Design a protein around this ligand. Sequence first.
Ligand SMILES: [Zn+2]
Ligand SMILES: [Zn+2]
Ligand SMILES: [Zn+2]
Ligand SMILES: [Zn+2]
Ligand SMILES: [Zn+2]
Ligand SMILES: [Zn+2]
Ligand SMILES: [Zn+2]
Ligand SMILES: [Zn+2]
Ligand SMILES: [Zn+2]
Ligand SMILES: [Zn+2]
Length: 315
Amino acid sequence: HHFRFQSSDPAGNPNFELQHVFADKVKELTNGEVTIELMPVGTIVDYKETPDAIQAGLIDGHITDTSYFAGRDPAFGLIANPVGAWADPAQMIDFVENGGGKELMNELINPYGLQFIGVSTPGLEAFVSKVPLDTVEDLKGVKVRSPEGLIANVFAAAGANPVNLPSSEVYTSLDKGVIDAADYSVFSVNQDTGMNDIAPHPVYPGFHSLPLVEVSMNKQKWDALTPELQAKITEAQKIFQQTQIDTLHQRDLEAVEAAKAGGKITVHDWSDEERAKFRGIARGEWEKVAGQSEMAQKVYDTLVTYLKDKGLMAE
Ligand SMILES: [Zn+2]
Ligand SMILES: [Zn+2]
Ligand SMILES: [Zn+2]
Ligand SMILES: [Zn+2]
Ligand SMILES: [Zn+2]
Ligand SMILES: [Zn+2]
Ligand SMILES: [Zn+2]
Ligand SMILES: [Zn+2]
Ligand SMILES: [Zn+2]
Ligand SMILES: [Zn+2]
């Protein structure tokens, strides 16, 4: 079997490169009986149309940002990045693999002719801040660069003042005082960009943005495989997932070490209690999204049940 998968990332991009692990491990684990051809974003079709292309047989799968499909159903946006839910990728991965998330993903994408194989992420983002934030209360009044939608709405619910800016304007806007803090990227990027130098109170691990990248394929083709090959492909995906998370973690740790060694940057790790408080604020916004569709309510119910059960949110 030879299956062509389209990525949401371009050639060159470090996450695209990490995705080679999925293809390589599928070939290794199946001793060649299944091969994956990994294609950069836009090779065969538009990044928002990969589901269509998969069910049609034009490509066989994708590795992509599930938030791209929020237009189909708000549930997609909510499950892809339930702002504030996670303090580490392991939490989200456990939610998917053992807490009902994978079943939700298949309920969402089987109707499009896709089988959800497994989850990955480009990383839990770190927060950029010029002002010292150790509690949720510290967010009140802070001008925070926030993407439109659930991220901005959660920061507003926390009493912050969201500001809408392109990524390329964040650095100068901090310097000029237009913003005091920002959503940007993972710590290693924030650090490399000089963000933490001009805004010397980052929060790491971050507390608000952890995007879900799905690995999914044509469900008819999936269903035609033997159990042992399905298990090997799921295994390959898990290996890719773990290699990606560990690689991201190491790069962040490198950057944090450099930040701390300079003696000026204070890296704040919010307590479990403060993170649980942030979940509670965010939950009010998740619930608004939950009311927008049946599947969004199901995502909300499953997520909140998981968080309460794990002691991550007030019972
Ligand atoms: Zn404080
Ligand atoms: Zn971000
Ligand atoms: Zn670097
Ligand atoms: Zn500097
Ligand atoms: Zn076969
Ligand atoms: Zn690690
Ligand atoms: Zn080091
Ligand atoms: Zn911690
Ligand atoms: Zn506290
Ligand atoms: Zn439990």
